Ligand SMILES: [Cl-]
Ligand SMILES: [Cl-]
């Protein structure tokens with residue numbers, strides 16, 4: 763079985779925890795327990811990745827200097843784990859079904875960076891275009907963290923994911939970036955970039 767590198771594991775941990783925080787906020791904004799459950803599942807993936815990272819890091823150091831260097835990696839992974847656990851604490855609030863103070867959703871919709879729901883209409887030029895080909899993060903500033911398609915969720919969709927009419931995109935970005943993508947998704951804006 764092909765071994766992974768410390769960097770591959772590290773990159774997945776970093777990418778994953780970022781997705782987790784975004785999804786944690788999304789679960790609070792929409793009071794969505796399925797999103798919240800995904801966060802807890804990602805928390806488990808982070809623990810597994812952290813374990814592999816420690817296994818690799820331990821085995822990779824044989825002398826003092828190497829040891830000192832692998833320790834810096836473990837220290838950062840520990841910080842990532844702290845963030846992962848914090849995101850899990852937010853998701854747990856949603857799973858418990860507590861009544862959220864109204865300012866919470868408002869805060870999520872009004873910060874420098876926000877979470878937004880974007881409905882894709884049939885006439886939108888993005889229909890039929892995969893995420894890889896579109897790369898919305900790059901071309902629109904709107905980062906897609908999940909997609910609701912009917913009765914199913916696609917979390918952290920890759921480049922092989924193709925957008926369809928009816929899809930509901932969950933994005934993270936500035937308010938103006940979100941309103942802009944909504945116009946594109948509606949069909950009002952026929953041009954992308
Ligand atoms: Cl690598
Ligand atoms: Cl379609």
Ligand code: NA
Nearest residue numbers: 820821823824
């Ligand atoms: Na060692």
Ligand code: NA
Nearest residue numbers: 912928929930
């Ligand atoms: Na739909």
